[PDB]
Amino acid sequence: KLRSRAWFDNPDDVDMTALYLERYMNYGLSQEELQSGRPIIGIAQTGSDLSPCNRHHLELAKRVRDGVREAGGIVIEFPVHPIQETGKRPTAGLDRNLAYLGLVEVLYGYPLDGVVLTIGCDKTTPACLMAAATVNIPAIALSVGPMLNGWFRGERTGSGTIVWKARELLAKGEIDYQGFVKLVASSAPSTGYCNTMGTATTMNSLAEALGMQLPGSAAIPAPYRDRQEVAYLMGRRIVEMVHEDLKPSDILTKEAFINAIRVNSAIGGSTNAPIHLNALARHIGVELTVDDWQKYGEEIPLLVNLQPAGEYLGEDYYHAGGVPAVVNQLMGQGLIHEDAITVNGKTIGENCKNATIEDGNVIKTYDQPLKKHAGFRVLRGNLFSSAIMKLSVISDEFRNRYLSDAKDPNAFEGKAVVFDGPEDYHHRIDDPALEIDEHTVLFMRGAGPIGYPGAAEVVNMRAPDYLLKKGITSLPCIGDGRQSGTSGSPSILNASPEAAAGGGLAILKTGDRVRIDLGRGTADILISDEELAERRKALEAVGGYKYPESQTPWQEIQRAVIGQMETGAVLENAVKYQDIAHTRGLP
Amino acid sequence: KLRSRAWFDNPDDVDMTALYLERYMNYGLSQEELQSGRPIIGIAQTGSDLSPCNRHHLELAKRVRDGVREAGGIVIEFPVHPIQETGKRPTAGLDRNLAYLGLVEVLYGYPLDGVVLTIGCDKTTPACLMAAATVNIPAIALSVGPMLNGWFRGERTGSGTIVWKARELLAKGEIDYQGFVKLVASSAPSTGYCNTMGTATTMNSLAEALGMQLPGSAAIPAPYRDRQEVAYLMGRRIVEMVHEDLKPSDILTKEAFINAIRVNSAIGGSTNAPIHLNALARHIGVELTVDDWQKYGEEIPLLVNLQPAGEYLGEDYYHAGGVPAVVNQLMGQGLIHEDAITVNGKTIGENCKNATIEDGNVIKTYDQPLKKHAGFRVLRGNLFSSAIMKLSVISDEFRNRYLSDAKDPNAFEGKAVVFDGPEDYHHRIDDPALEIDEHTVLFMRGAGPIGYPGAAEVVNMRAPDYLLKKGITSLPCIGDGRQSGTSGSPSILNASPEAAAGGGLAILKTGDRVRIDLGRGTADILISDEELAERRKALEAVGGYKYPESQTPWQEIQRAVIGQMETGAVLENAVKYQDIAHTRGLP
Amino acid sequence: KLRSRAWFDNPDDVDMTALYLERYMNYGLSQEELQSGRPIIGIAQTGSDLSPCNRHHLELAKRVRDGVREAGGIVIEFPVHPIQETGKRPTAGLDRNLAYLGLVEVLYGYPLDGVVLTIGCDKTTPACLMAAATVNIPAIALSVGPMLNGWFRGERTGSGTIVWKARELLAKGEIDYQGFVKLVASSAPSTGYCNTMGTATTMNSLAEALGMQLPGSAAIPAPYRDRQEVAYLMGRRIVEMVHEDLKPSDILTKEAFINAIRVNSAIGGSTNAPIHLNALARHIGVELTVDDWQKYGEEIPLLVNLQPAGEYLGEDYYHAGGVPAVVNQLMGQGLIHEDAITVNGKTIGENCKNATIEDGNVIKTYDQPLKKHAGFRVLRGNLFSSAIMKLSVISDEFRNRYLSDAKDPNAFEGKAVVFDGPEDYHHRIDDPALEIDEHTVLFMRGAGPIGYPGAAEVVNMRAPDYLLKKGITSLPCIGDGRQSGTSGSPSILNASPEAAAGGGLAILKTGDRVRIDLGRGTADILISDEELAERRKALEAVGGYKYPESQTPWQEIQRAVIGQMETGAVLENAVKYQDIAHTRGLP
Ligand SMILES: [Cl-]
Ligand SMILES: [Cl-]
Ligand SMILES: [Cl-]
Ligand SMILES: [Cl-]
Ligand SMILES: [Cl-]
Ligand SMILES: [Cl-]
Ligand SMILES: [Cl-]
Ligand SMILES: [Cl-]
Ligand SMILES: [Zn+2]
Ligand SMILES: [Zn+2]
Ligand SMILES: [Zn+2]
């Protein structure tokens, strides 16, 4: 019944059994350990020098080993392909699908009965969970946790968030280029990932909300001894999960994805969460669209008072009660599917029914929330088939300026300024010839999965310095790229199809009038449908949208099969491989 | 001039520089270390629990770190995707190209000025060297080394080789199925890779002969303290190589490949060496064909008395003088390109001019060799466009039986028995209905890069047990797969194109007369050219050669671009990416 | 000039040089590394499973190694004998002198040119510094740092301090015996030592004030990446200190001890600091008495607002500016000997001249201090030749009750209740027959270096529960033992000579009137000098003071040479060994 026995204890094939035993005993494992029906537990290790965010997982694996051994298993630790958001060029999103490919190969083709997935930095959570979904042997995820709180002259400084606030304090002469480095260094005072509500905190929280972590695990800061005890408890549990055959497909049900969509809104989750969870849904065989994110999550209020939306940081999120406290608030409104089973063998409802808010400054009750209507809205129209807007970081300046007109409520119109990539933007934003005022919507195209190739976090553009000196902070930002989860920009992201894939962004000229109507969920460049096909005819004639040639073999290989962000930016030909450890391997 | 400064010390982009610094300082590296022009040295780490052969590299990296620090560099250790020959299913050759892809992405897209490649198990050497070739920043390779000698009742037992000798001592009732495990376990008495002249010993020796290791490094057994001192010396040297900009393209010249072809013959190298070095040649932009292997290497004699061809093991190879002693014997005949520069900054001729044979039982002089004419012969004909034959392991039983006829010298004819994969063979070999005698040539088809998908080491087939009980040991083996380097079978391997790619093997019927003529280098099934196209017409009509559907996304992705073993079984669309760290990234 | 060459590079003795080289090369060190005049740097490692407080030093040593290698040295890491305050029975003070003995043997008898001392838990700081003082090769100390702040329902909880507050919240029915464990576990949320102003924080701060750490090093919490960068900087510096021959005797001058006495008062240092620094003074050959502590430190105000005296914890102490900020406040009053050289090669005055208070809630200015007159007073009389009183934790309840009488200001009298050890006290304190009221001074005898043997932290006795239920919290505590540095008890400690050494405590009967006069610095049992010798005659006649027989060989060996706490509780025959690396070895 244990698939590892086909390698280490196969009486029908004496020759090959002796071959695997010989190699896997050369650092002291005994024949009896490998031939006594003990679960072989992989640790999918994401920590290294090259991934500082996840590096503490090298130490946490020691506690995992204690739990596995004690429970009767054997650990085989092995590496996941490196991903690092602050490091990989041109973009670390290029590499989520590559790490997925390799991890599928290890889980499928080696004698592993179960796996501990070490998650942390932005894309390691989906890469690990996607591969676990495809192979579908029992799997449990362990967050490494955020860095400790940053401290600067008595105030909390958040990683990532302090950058966008210092990039406006530097571009206004109020901060030099040397003290800019000190204010940023203060925000990374320990090991762990981003300590704001960035993509990493989002995805690790959602991994718990999905049922893939022990309750309370996601929020624990990396240097806390609580993280080390949880690592041990997961080592014990994954062995029992093997005996129970508790698989990702048993846990990652539609109602688990619904719980995660609603927790995402309540915690202020990143605009990257729909990309990664739609990816995961497809790889486990559950249907989940961008429209589901609006349907289940748009009207959920924001409860977690964390930067960039709020004031506090990861340590405070943990002390306040973390994911269980958030789930418990949603349970009080009947907005949690409480019977969804989780890795610890209990339902999310049983795990969270007694979770209280332990700090009311950091986590708000549902009825007195931090902000209402904090989910995602999907915008459609001639600009793109889908894009989403981060409603949780709309400020009162943005609300009072743009969303306050009696002629057209919850809607605005303005002039469009288009940049073709982040380099084009960084060379034209401060250019006074552009005449960027209070009625301008900046566009960023060519930054999607195929165009960049990435996709890259380049949409949260800053206003020109002649507008930031007058007092205009945030401006409408729309693009076919992404943004950092730590961004407090209420941008219109993830436009699908991208420009390089025939999206309407490809034919937008700077100076065209555009109308973003959040009420009717539309996003159109105000032009003729006749002139629309004329711009597209001239495009196909002069060769399609222009974007850089591939620079590596993987760039080229991935560009030929990758789909759009709307559906997870997955390798499209990989999705047919379902439950491959048990369906012999699938089409 | 150091490419790492674009990440850690880029005054034009203050924002992003602060971002990389923040993350890479969170385990204690100082700003000064990262912003003082110090070479950033990657360690491409191949050791893990999942790769027992290479696992000691986790410990060797400590000595590498000492050398890099002392020389003024900074180490960033990161993982290579796991490959393990005794472990990966269905074949570890499926994963050489996947590890290549990921390592290209790390070297190209991270702030690395140079890299230490940790090599060992069969495919880690080419995977690491291929990726280093594509990116072409300074790189040095470190072998982990073989396991210690096996000992069984006073005799040396070799890993891999003891299996083929116990698989014939078990299939003849002279060894049970429990004592079979003990005789094999004795051959793996420490950490390290195979201690015979297998693929790992071959490829690690060739890496030194190519100029990519310090002289004397390849042969050192893994547990020897000499291995730890060499690791430190390489850490020092890679930093100097960065200052000198000594690149793989400077070292991997045509004449380096010629030196390796000739060292391969002298050491008894594996039939997998042409696949991996033709791959490496293409990835560095040097021309190298299977015909070059015959042209430069066929007539070189066998000098190393190691199992499977000979008697001794890896420790003895090291004590006898290792690669330098072999090179020095070839230098005495003027058969080494002595001016080829190597990683230590000296030519291979200067490194080896004083290397002596220290044990004459283990390494023979050129003039009194162990065997003559020990290289590869290329066979062509209607069976395949190319295949090679391992001349160094032809026994006197094989020579006296097959290669001793006055009607046709150095040639034989016989009946063909075809198996479609290793499973078909293991179900028909002992079948008495086959009537396999002294005039039978067994064929193995469907085992190539696309068919298996692998390719897999399945050609060294054993004779039926009714022939092994009479006294017939080795039989002619021909196929479109590979064999283990530890095999003493003089097989005809690496047939290109494979059956699944339209090779002549696809239309061979069991019972057809075949003629292998080593004199004229031909290999034909004795049939009509008219009937040849008829069998092929019926094939294309009934759908092509049959082989398993892909089981994973990577299997499918790789099958669409992988080429044939004749030209390295590389990803064909990857070869256009040349010197991509300096040519901006290449087409 | 490097003493390590007598081992590794001694041309006069070829035989023995080859012997040491052979052994120390067996894990890969080269002959050239050991025979090229490179400083051999020991790391005196105090971390282990058995010493949780110091265990992170096992990880910090990696950064130390980077700095030593980079600077041109070689690291030899070796262990210090385990000491652990929360762990060793019957007392961890028994083992400070044993760790000292062993570390002297390593530094003196091995080829070490310099040493990094890893300090942390209470007694590792003096044990390491004492041994470094005796041998006197260049030495630098590295604190591991405190644990992170404890958090319980929105409030800071300190390790050790939360115990004394929960031992009074448990002994009053307001806390059960299970929730008692949770409130204490919250105070230890990471690796590191006690996060209050306990003995560890005291001694590590004083090690910096003495000049034995890089400026700013003492206060850094253990999990902060700042700790890892400082570890690296010390590895670099110790190599330069070897070239400069900057020795403990150059740094630990009388004026360094004066700086530490005054910093001790300003930070609220533990009553154990005089024991350990008088020990260190004697081992380096500087004169320092308990009277010096009063003379130089009594009138210094308390500036650090840390538990137990104040509100904050170790992280806040670091953010506020740590030791340099405290030194800078004392410099502003001319109370620092600013020209005392420190390990980094600069004077303490140059290192601290620009150190500012960064959080005014945590560190107070000298002129608006937290409390005045916060040092130690020495009490003498017929009870003991010396004892000290912790003036920084005298509460207003203690001040208003006891130190507020017009008949005798700053003085009190009361009834004496004597317990013979902690076991006797724990069996009699709550006994209602004792009738303990507002005019009772509790005594603890038999707890000194010889009696316990310890000495043990047993003097901070709690009031009976019938007094704690009425409202009487703190009572006068006097004894020949110690107390925890985390104690907010204004006790009279360290009585010398102890009862078991003939101190006046040995003849004190319960019920005797005693008069503690802090004004005249006297402490007498109000009895006749005639009756005093009568009680002592009856003692010597009936055999001396009673105390347990030795339980281990070390207990017995130490009892025969150990002196009293007044003079450091050192091995008295060890003090004559001065500068033994250079004076051939001393008498
Ligand atoms: Cl690993
Ligand atoms: Cl905090
Ligand atoms: Cl619902
Ligand atoms: Cl690694
Ligand atoms: Cl041997
Ligand atoms: Cl030649
Ligand atoms: Cl140690
Ligand atoms: Cl003074
Ligand atoms: Zn990250
Ligand atoms: Zn191997
Ligand atoms: Zn301690």
Automatic annotation (TrEMBL), chains A, B, C:
Zn(2+) binds at residues 53, 121-122. Signal peptide: none annotated. It is an enzyme of class 4 (lyase). Pfam families: ILV_EDD_C, ILVD_EDD_N. PROSITE patterns: ILVD_EDD_1. One of its GO terms (molecular function) is metal ion binding. Residues 361-569 form the Dihydroxy-acid/6-phosphogluconate dehydratase C-terminal domain. Residues 38-351 form the Dihydroxy-acid/6-phosphogluconate dehydratase N-terminal domain. InterPro entries: Dihydro-acid_dehy_C (IPR042096), DiOHA_6PGluconate_deHydtase_CS (IPR020558), ILV_EDD_C (IPR056740), ILV_EDD_N (IPR000581), IlvD/EDD_N (IPR037237), Sugar_Degrad_Dehydratases (IPR052352). Its EC number is 4.2.1.6. Keywords: Iron, Iron-sulfur, Lyase, Metal-binding, Zinc. Belongs to the IlvD/Edd family. This is Dihydroxy-acid and 6-phosphogluconate dehydratase:ATP/GTP-binding site motif A (P-loop). It comes from Brucella abortus (strain 2308).
